[PDB]
Design a protein around this ligand. Structure first.
Ligand code: MD1
Ligand code: SF4
Ligand code: SF4
Ligand code: F3S
Ligand code: 6MO
Lengths: 224, 1244, 509
């Protein structure tokens, strides 16, 4: 158990992270033609407006929450103590998770049972979406466990682990001592998504079109 | 690194533009190579399409990755004069999609054989070491023969090998020839102009062994019988470039943009030169989009409009204000001044035969063929026999020309047109009128079956002492049109508003076209022709030529052009466009295709009569000759079934026969020897006595039907085969969808020349062999399918009526999988046949019948009337009152060696055509050097015919169109007949010699040849009749001029001596079946028209996914919105169309442009794609020809009469089809009969 | 003032025979791949009709093109930058595959492999290229409405019938139909470029061809909605969009596009147009949409004007391009004769593929008619195709320029007929339309005779300029996979080097 503990929480996170980064770079340099969102909307517009919006708006809310929840150092401290952050995560994060899960399930039902989509899908699209649906569900299932420690003691452990990992401080797994198993699973599946990321459609995330908001409308390319 | 490049974000930003609206970037663009590398290819090869479209377009075939990937048009044709647009790029959508076939899912890769036939073939070979005897054991066993014939069109094809199929085919051929006769083996292939050598391949093999070569021009109804009738010419028309020289064009029943696509630009561009265009179509067709005026007469009533227009023209430009140009033209180039004898009737006279020199005392000084020389009066009241009449063509020389000279004194004379003002008296002549007859679907105008007109006449004292009244064709014509000339004729018009036989008012009732339009356009058309001296043209097509009375539609247009002197003048004339019938190097190709270099003659047959007979469509005939006779004809002299007229025509040498005799023609020589007399005399004696009979008399006795049929470059059973269900039943012996009862079941009148049996012989064909590159409907019903090379995988040549260029088909890559070119396929069959026939067939003697040929001295057969030797009305004289009886020696074991070498007859006899011959030794000497020669064997020392290129070079070297040396010798030969030099027409190109490899480099314009009537010149475009008008060469007609009067007995008695309006015939195919198999939905009868489609050329390309995607995804039928709504049919609904002949299934295309009353199923969507089961037949849905049936016309059977004499594809019965009516209804149950459990039901 | 050049195209609709050859050749070359089998870069539509995709001209429905806001500024009808990004998770205006058609194939092999003993004749049924499943029936295609295929009430939903009392056209005698072949307009103010969040779409500086970078495109599929001509097609397999590339591989060396050289009717003309890029926004944002046509003509520059010539040279336009512009058939038809007109100028994209309107048979009348100003030939007032329909299609509803083009074509005919039939000079019709004999004769040379060298006047795109053609000539095409193409920075993770480049630097300067 201690062996598996150090593997998944001290070793695996760096394997997943290395693969995520070098895999992204290598696919960007050698696979531009494969770098796309892979829209399937034209083949079947039914239910996509609701499903995709619920899923994306929901998962983006989760991303923002997770990002600032685990990466924001405790000193940045009096106004946002750990237990206040937890309440935010449970309610704001919970709401986003519900939106995400509903959208995700609708998208998965579509991918599996809509003839035109199922017929043109790749195995990776099914795998990656299935894992996201499961991860989101696991996420929501942690809420009743966090509710057992409204003082933020559990979150303090998870945030401690996350910050140790990203700052390359060994012994990260020790921060997780005593945390509920559900959180363990969530963390492992989450890191696994980073591992699979560069070999799936998730690479579209890197391409969020921020620069469009300030770009001149017309583009002309000179002789080159 | 593309990733690292992202950091050069700002550094790549150049200047902004348009005040911040734009940004210029300096970024990488290497990705653009992605599309550049797709365009890049290995090479381009010049090739064309062997399809019957008349396009004859040269393409660039792109090879990439060692495969054919796509094609784009060549644009390097020799440019036309500076004042004319050039031809490039030509092309069409069908052709642009051909590349799809090479590796498509419907490509034929290996030789295939019906499983049941293979099983028996191999079991038979195991008991019979000799394949001929193996075939016998199968075919002589009723149960075995039936087992594979009933499997036709029912799956079970299995992969075979060239060795296996070639042996079976050769064995079957030998057995058939040996036991029944060589003419029991036949081949069907059309339009050689699209791929000359490919056609020649099968025709050459068949001709060597004595098999019958089936015709196609008449069969497809592309042949306009009015052409031979009027000009003694199959078909000769101006090139599309010549349209640009016209200042007034009427597109009549010709959908130019859709059916003449690559040439359409000449039509759209000439408009910019000030040319006015008029479209005449019942529907708003594509052609209308391009014209200045759209006239929409009721379909099938066009002759009425043409008659009314001609009426106006004659009245205003010939009578009231005589046009100097028109008057002179008709005086010198028509038979109008010719004299016609009047026949005494009860109270009036009828127009009889034309006066002949032989009818007068001293025969007008003519001692040669006086009975074949027409007569007229000169301006000085003197009677004369002008030069040019057919009588001067043979037996003498120097007077067969159009010089206005006295055929006796050789002095100049001026012919008089009308007798009005010098007549001895006025006589009343009756004219037939049919405008009052017709079905309920067309408007009629009641007058009188016989219209009496006052004609100026003159009494003459004939040689036999008797006396007779005569009048000119001119006067007879004006009366026929209803022109009042001051004699106070009650049946003549007092004005254009007077409803009389043939006025604008009259035509308005019949056609529905406003009289003011008929008047305005007729006037503009004639006015233009007067101002320009004949530059008015009429482009006409199948819209008019596919009706039963196509001759009336055509003679109507033809008369308009003749009256305005448009025929023979660049920019004017009759522009008939249908199939690609113009194989320019004609006399170079004929010997190759029909093995005339080795044996003469071959066995040509007119297919309409052939199929009417063998597919037993005559057993269901509803049309009678009696109901077609003139009201002034002796009904008792024309009794019998329509087929009876054909049998009589055959025995009189008018039309060919096939099979020919009721006895194996290879056995007659032996019997003749034993009888102590030569074969010819023995045959004639046997025919008179009845010991030997024409096979046509007993087509179902078991020895008089074809047994082996080769089909290539044709989809006979899915495209051109009228009476589809009859072919399946009688030729194939499979299930069929015929709905009606035959003559016997109805207790009708049985023929008087043909035997009858209640249960007709079925499954007549023992072996059906089809060569194709795609599995067509015909392949689906064959016994053996042979994979042939596509047009992009073989060498050949192609020419067309549209332009004067000869170019090639070339192999871009060797044929894929196991495919072989048609030439190599037949060469291999010829090789196997040669070894398999040993011991069965050796040096045989064949007795071949040959009908009296047009353009041969024998065309002067029966001059004054029709005599039937079998009736004892005359002696049986082969070549005059019967067909020529020829002896042909065949060396069966040498078939292959002969096939692959140019025979000795070219050197021993020579070459020729169209009535002339020449020496071609120099050409054979050249060919020996180009093709090399046989080292030994039967053909030792003869030029080789090993490859398709060797064959192409033979064609090019022998033909006058492609060899200036031959061209001069050809024009020289003609000069002997006319007495006028014509060599000046080719002297300036006498050194020209077109070579196969040069045309691969650039298409080459051909040389002016006597084979045609137009010129290939750089100052004047090609225009038909140009040589007749400018070189004074006679048209090959009785009078030597454009013949307005058809005086042959049959023509007179069937009411067509002069053009007259004839309403669409009643096929009676609907009333007996409508409502008999109701599915609950309303049914309605509609006219079934089959104009040619936009998503294919016939059935070719019909299965091509590109064409199917741009079309409607499969078989569809066009209906008017009114008819569709009446029937409860929505756009794209499944519908069923049917009648007594069969049924078809398809989806509806509902449109406003289709007039109520008619339906259009574009011609050829065939039977292999997207067709559900039929609710009528309970079988797979049929095709457009499942609802048609062959019905011949007697006037098309006429022979032995100058211009009305036989010629392969020159004359014969035609496959008309537009008069057909069908029952239409929405389908209910949509069952696919495939066991997929995926059927539908259309509610209500 | 910034001069740029582009090879524009003019299609003479009066000569179009609606054959679709242009569509087939393009398809064979560029779009026969799975993913774009349903895409027809060049497609021909019969009018009246709704087209491909269905009702593409309905911008209220599809949201294509630009709008001019109250403040005078331009904005994609799709929404501004933020509005557009807000629709990225699911483009609400996106055309579905059904708006085009479900691509199909047939089971031809059943004809070959049907087993012995089949109860009925085997047949090839349709199958979907999207699902591979049997299709009970084909219900749509890219050219379903060809030649008025469909009930008038359905075809007449045609956007161009707006503001027209169309009832009379449902009558048989008043029937009319025309052809509208179309491809990408390679606009001066393309809405696609402006609506792509990744900036993968761009207009090439040297020849104005608009392309979708297949490396950079991220499959946001917003551009498809942005294009008012719906000429961008999503490749459902690659997940990226593709469009007519104006056959740049051929244009680059001076060859005509495939659809141009293969046009059977000889209606397509290719010629250079010099334009002031700095005036694009000003022209496209003119207040009245009926002024867009002229505003664009104002952006085109006179190639024979030494002021323009010197500016062009200063701005980098190659000498051969300027020379080509001086004999451009497109310039003559659009600027001099005023025969060619833009397609839907109201979308505000400043389209570069223009059209000469078609003539048509005279309309139905109570009588056969009388001689008019053009004698036996038609007067513009008698043509059966309603001019308002053509104006809705080409001039934002203004009939004036359409009438002028049609009248001039007819005038040329009248003048040529007097010459070739009567053998006389009659400039009456020409004078009435403001044409000289010289102009009428040149019009005739280009439109009627239309020699190949006159239809296509395409200069080289000069790929040697600002680049290194020598090493490229020696090594292009060896696609072994060096992994160094597509980036300017030389560093690459696989430690390779470009096959078509020189890496050993000269040390002798
Ligand atoms: N794309 C394509 N091109 C081809 C062919 C093809 O299969 N596809 N086949 C070749 C061959 S072999 C032939 S015989 C011709 O194309 C037939 O075309 P054509 O335009 O003469 O006949 P069609 O029978 O189509 O008739 C033309 C139009 O005339 C109208 N029409 C039909 N019936 C009538 C009538 O009774 N009277 C009058 N005045 N018009 C009538 C109609 O608009 C039709 O399309 C030719 N090239
Ligand atoms: S099918 Fe005929 S008309 Fe069409 S491109 Fe080929 S040769 Fe030309
Ligand atoms: S090829 Fe030319 S004439 Fe034919 S549809 Fe295309 S644009 Fe029109
Ligand atoms: S929006 Fe841009 S990302 Fe691609 S799909 Fe269109 S070019
Ligand atoms: Mo034909």
């Amino acid at each position: 158990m201690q062996f598996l503990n150090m593997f998944f929480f001290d070793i695996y996170p760096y394997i997943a992270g290395a693969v995520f980064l070098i895999g992204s770079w290598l696919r960007y340099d050698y696979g531009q033609y494969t770098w796309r969102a892979a829209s399937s909307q034209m083949l079947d517009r039914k239910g996509m407006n609701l499903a995709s919006n619920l899923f994306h708006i929901g998962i983006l809310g989760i991303f923002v929450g997770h990002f600032f929840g685990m990466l924001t150092p405790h000193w940045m401290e009096a106004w946002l103590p750990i237990e206040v952050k937890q309440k935010m995560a449970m309610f704001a994060g919970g709401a986003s998770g519900v939106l995400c899960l509903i959208g995700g399930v609708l998208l998965l039902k579509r991918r599996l049972f809509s003839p035109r989509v199922r017929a043109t899908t790749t195995g990776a699209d099914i795998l990656i979406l299935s894992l996201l649906v499961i991860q989101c569900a696991l996420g929501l299932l942690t809420i009743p466990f966090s509710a057992q420690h409204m003082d933020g003691s559990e979150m303090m452990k998870l945030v401690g682990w996350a910050q140790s990992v990203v700052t390359f401080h060994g012994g990260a797994s020790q921060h997780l001592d005593g945390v509920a198993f559900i959180f363990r699973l969530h963390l492992v599946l989450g890191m696994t998504l980073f591992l699979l990321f560069p070999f799936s459609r998730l690479i579209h995330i890197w391409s969020v079109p921020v620069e469009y908001l300030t770009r001149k409308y017309q583009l002309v390319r000179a002789r080159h | 690194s593309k990733f690292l490049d992202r950091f050069r974000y700002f550094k790549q930003k150049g200047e902004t533009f348009a005040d911040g609206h734009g940004q210029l970037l300096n970024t990488n663009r290497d990705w653009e190579d992605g599309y550049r590398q797709r365009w890049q290819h290995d090479k381009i090869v010049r090739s064309t399409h062997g399809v019957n479209c008349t396009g004859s377009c040269s393409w660039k075939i792109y090879v990439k990755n060692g495969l054919v990937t796509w094609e784009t048009q060549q644009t390097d044709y020799p440019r036309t004069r500076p004042d004319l647009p050039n031809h490039e790029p030509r092309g069409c959508p069908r052709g642009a999609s051909y590349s799809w076939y090479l590796y498509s899912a419907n490509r034929l890769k290996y030789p295939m054989m019906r499983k049941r036939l293979m099983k028996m073939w191999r079991e038979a070979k195991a008991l019979h070491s000799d394949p001929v005897e193996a075939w016998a054991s199968i075919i002589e066993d009723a149960d075995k023969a039936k087992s594979f014939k009933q499997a036709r069109g029912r799956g079970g094809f299995v992969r075979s090998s060239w060795q296996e199929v070639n042996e079976l085919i050769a064995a079957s051929n030998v057995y058939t020839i040996k036991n029944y006769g060589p003419d029991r083996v036949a081949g069907f292939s059309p339009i050689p102009a699209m791929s000359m050598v490919s056609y020649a391949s099968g025709a050459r093999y068949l001709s060597l062994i004595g098999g019958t070569c089936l015709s196609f021009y008449d069969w497809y109804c592309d042949l306009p019988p009015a052409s031979p009738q009027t000009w003694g010419e199959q078909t000769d028309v101006p090139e599309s470039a010549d349209w640009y020289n016209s200042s007034y064009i009427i597109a009549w029943g010709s959908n130019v943009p859709q059916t003449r696509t690559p040439d359409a630009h000449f039509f759209t561009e000439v408009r910019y030169k000030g040319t006015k265009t008029v479209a005449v179509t019942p529907d708003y067709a594509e052609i209308a989009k391009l014209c200045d005026l759209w006239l929409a007469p009721k379909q099938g009533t066009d002759a009425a409009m043409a008659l009314a227009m001609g009426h106006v023209m004659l009245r205003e430009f010939h009578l009231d204000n005589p046009s100097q140009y028109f008057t002179d033209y008709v005086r010198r180039y028509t038979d109008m001044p010719m004299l016609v004898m009047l026949e005494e009737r009860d109270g009036y006279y009828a127009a009889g035969r034309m006066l002949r020199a032989a009818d007068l005392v001293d025969a007008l000084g003519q001692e040669n063929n006086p009975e074949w020389k027409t007569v007229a009066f000169n301006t000085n009241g003197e009677m004369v026999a002008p030069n040019g009449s057919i009588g001067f063509r043979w037996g003498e020389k120097g007077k067969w020309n159009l010089e206005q000279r006295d055929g006796k004194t050789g002095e100049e004379t001026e012919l008089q047109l009308s007798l009005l003002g010098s007549q001895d008296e006025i006589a009343e002549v009756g004219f037939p009128y049919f405008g009052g007859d017709g079905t309920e679907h067309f408007n009629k105008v009641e007058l009188e079956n016989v219209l009496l007109h006052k004609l100026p006449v003159k009494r003459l004292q004939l040689a036999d002492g008797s006396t007779a009244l005569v009048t000119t064709v001119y006067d007879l014509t004006l009366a026929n049109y209803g022109l009042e000339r001051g004699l106070n004729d009650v049946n003549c018009a007092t004005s254009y508003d007077d409803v009389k036989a043939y006025t604008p008012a009259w035509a308005e009732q019949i056609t529905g076209v406003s009289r003011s339009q008929i008047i305005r356009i007729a006037r503009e058309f004639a006015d233009n022709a007067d101002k320009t001296h004949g530059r008015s043209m009429i482009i006409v097509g199948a819209g008019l030529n596919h009706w039963y009375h196509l001759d009336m539609n055509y003679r109507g247009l033809i008369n308009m052009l003749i009256f305005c002197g448009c025929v023979g003048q660049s920019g004017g004339g009759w522009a008939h466009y249908v199939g690609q019938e113009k194989l320019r190097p004609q006399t170079g190709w004929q010997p190759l295709a029909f093995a005339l270099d080795w044996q003469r003659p071959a066995r040509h047959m007119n297919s309409t009569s052939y199929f009417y007979n063998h597919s037993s469509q005559w057993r269901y005939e509803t049309v009678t000759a009696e109901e077609l006779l003139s009201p002034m004809a002796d009904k008792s002299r024309y009794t019998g079934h329509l087929i009876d007229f054909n049998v009589r025509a055959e025995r009189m040498g008018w039309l060919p026969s096939a099979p020919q005799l009721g006895t194996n023609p290879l056995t007659i020589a032996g019997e003749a020897e034993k009888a102590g007399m030569n074969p010819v005399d023995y045959t004639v004696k046997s025919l008179k006595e009845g010991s030997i009979r024409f096979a046509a008399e007993q087509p179902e006795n078991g020895k008089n039907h074809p047994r082996n049929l080769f089909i290539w470059r044709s989809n006979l059973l899915g495209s051109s085969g009228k009476g589809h269900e009859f072919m399946l039943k009688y030729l194939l012996g499979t299930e069929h969808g015929i709905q009606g009862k035959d003559l016997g079941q109805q207790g009708g009148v049985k023929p008087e020349e043909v035997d009858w049996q209640d249960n007709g012989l079925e499954g007549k064909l023992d072996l059906v062999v089809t060569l194709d590159f795609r599995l067509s409907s015909t392949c689906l019903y064959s016994d053996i399918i042979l994979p042939t090379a596509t047009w992009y995988e073989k060498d050949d040549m192609n020419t067309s009526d549209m332009h004067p260029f000869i170019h090639p088909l070339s192999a871009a890559v060797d044929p894929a999988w196991e495919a072989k070119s048609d030439w190599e396929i037949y060469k291999a069959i010829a090789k196997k046949f040669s070894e398999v026939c040993v011991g069965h067939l050796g040096k045989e003697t064949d007795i071949v019948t040959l009908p009296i040929q047009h353009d041969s001295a024998a065309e002067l057969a029966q001059p004054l009337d029709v005599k039937d030797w079998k009736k004892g009305e005359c002696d049986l004289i082969p070549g005059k009152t019967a067909p020529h009886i020829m002896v042909v020696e065949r060396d069966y074991p040498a078939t292959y060696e002969r096939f692959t070498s140019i025979g000795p007859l070219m050197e021993k006899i020579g070459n020729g055509g169209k009535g002339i011959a020449w020496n071609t030794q120099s050409e054979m000497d050249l060919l020996r050097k180009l093709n090399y020669t046989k080292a030994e064997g039967p053909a030792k020392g003869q030029p080789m015919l090993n490859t398709a290129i060797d064959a192409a070079e033979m064609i090019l070297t022998l033909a006058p169109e492609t060899n200036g040396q031959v061209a001069v010798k050809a024009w020289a030969a003609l000069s002997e007949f006319t007495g006028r030099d014509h060599t000046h027409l080719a002297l300036n190109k006498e050194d020209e010699k077109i070579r196969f490899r040069d045309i691969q480099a650039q298409p080459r314009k051909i040389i002016s040849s006597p084979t045609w009537s137009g010129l290939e010149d750089e100052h004047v475009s090609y225009n038909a009749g140009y040589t007749n008008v400018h070189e004074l060469i006679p048209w090959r007609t009785l009078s030597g001029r454009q013949q307005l009067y058809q005086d042959h007995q049959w023509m007179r008695d069937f009411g067509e001596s002069l053009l007259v309006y004839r309403p669409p015939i009643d096929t009676r195919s609907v009333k007996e079946v409508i409502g008999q198999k109701s599915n609950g939905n309303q049914e309605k009868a509609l006219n079934f028209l089959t104009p040619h489609q936009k998503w294919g050329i016939h059935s070719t390309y019909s299965d091509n996914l590109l064409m199917l995607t741009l079309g409607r995804g499969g078989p569809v039928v066009w209906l008017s919105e009114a008819d569709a709504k009446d029937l409860g049919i929505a756009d794209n609904d499944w519908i069923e169309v049917f009648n007594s002949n069969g049924a078809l299934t398809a989806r509806a295309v509902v449109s406003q442009r289709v007039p109520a009353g008619m339906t259009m199923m574009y011609h050829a969507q065939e039977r292999i794609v997207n067709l559900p089961g039929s609710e009528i037949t309970q079988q797979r849905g049929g095709i457009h020809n499942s609802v048609t049936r062959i019905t011949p016309k007697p006037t098309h059977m006429i022979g032995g009469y100058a211009h009305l004499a036989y010629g392969f594809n020159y004359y014969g019965t035609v496959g008309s089809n537009r008069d057909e009516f069908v029952v239409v209804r929405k389908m209910k149950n949509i069952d696919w009969l495939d066991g997929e459990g995926n059927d539908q039901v259309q509610e209500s | 003032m910034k001069i740029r050049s582009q090879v524009g195209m003019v299609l003479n609709l009066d000569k179009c025979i609606g054959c679709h050859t242009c569509s087939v050749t393009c398809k064979n070359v560029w779009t026969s791949r799975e993913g774009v089998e349903y895409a027809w870069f060049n497609n021909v539509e019969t009018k009246p009709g709704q087209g491909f995709p269905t009702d593409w001209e309905n911008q209220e429905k599809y949201k294509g093109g630009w709008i001019r806001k109250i403040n005078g500024k331009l904005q994609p009808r799709m929404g501004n930058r933020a509005m557009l990004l807000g629709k990225i998770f699911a483009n609400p205006h996106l055309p579905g595959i059904d708006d085009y058609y479900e691509p199909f194939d047939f089971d031809y092999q059943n004809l070959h492999t049907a087993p012995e003993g089949s109860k009925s004749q085997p047949i090839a049924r349709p199958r979907s290229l999207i699902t591979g499943e049997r299709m009970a029936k084909i219900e749509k295609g890219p050219n379903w409405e060809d030649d008025l295929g469909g009930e008038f009430d359905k075809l007449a939903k045609d956007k161009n019938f707006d503001n027209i009392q169309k009832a009379m056209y449902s009558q048989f005698e008043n029937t009319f139909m025309m052809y509208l072949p179309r491809l990408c307009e390679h606009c001066l103010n393309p809405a696609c470029v402006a609506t792509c969040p990744s900036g993968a779409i761009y207009k090439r500086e040297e020849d104005g061809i608009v392309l979708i970078d297949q490396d950079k495109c991220r499959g946001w599929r917003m551009c498809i909605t942005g294009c008012p001509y719906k000429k961008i097609y999503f490749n459902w397999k690659s997940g990226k969009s593709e469009k007519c590339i104006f056959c740049y591989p051929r244009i680059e060396a001076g060859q005509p596009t495939v659809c141009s050289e293969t046009c059977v009717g000889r209606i397509r003309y290719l010629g250079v147009l010099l334009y002031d890029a700095d005036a694009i926004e000003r022209a496209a944002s003119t207040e009245n949409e009926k002024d867009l046509y002229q505003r664009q003509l104002d952006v085109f520059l006179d190639p024979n004007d030494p002021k323009v010539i010197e500016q062009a040279i200063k701005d980098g336009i190659p000498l051969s391009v300027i020379e080509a512009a001086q004999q451009s058939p497109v310039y003559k038809m659009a600027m001099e004769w005023k025969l060619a007109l833009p397609l839907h100028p109201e979308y505000r994209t400043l389209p570069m593929v223009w059209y000469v309107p078609p003539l048509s048979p005279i309309q139905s009348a109570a009588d056969a008619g009388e001689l008019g100003s053009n004698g036996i030939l038609p007067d513009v007032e008698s043509l059966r195709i309603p001019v308002q329909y053509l104006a809705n299609l080409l001039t934002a509803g203004d009939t004036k320029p359409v009438l002028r083009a049609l009248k001039r074509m007819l005038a040329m005919r009248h003048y040529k007929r007097a010459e070739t039939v009567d053998g006389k000079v009659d400039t009456r019709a020409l004078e009435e339309v403001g044409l000289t004999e010289a102009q009428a004769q040149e019009m005739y040379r280009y439109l009627a005779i239309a020699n190949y060298e006159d239809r296509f006047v395409v200069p080289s795109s000069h790929r040697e300029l600002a680049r290194e053609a020598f090493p490229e000539k020696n090594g292009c095409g060896f696609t072994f996979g060096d992994g160094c193409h597509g980036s300017d920075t030389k560093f690459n993770l696989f430690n390779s080097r470009r096959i078509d480049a020189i890496d050993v630097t000269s040390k002798t300067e």
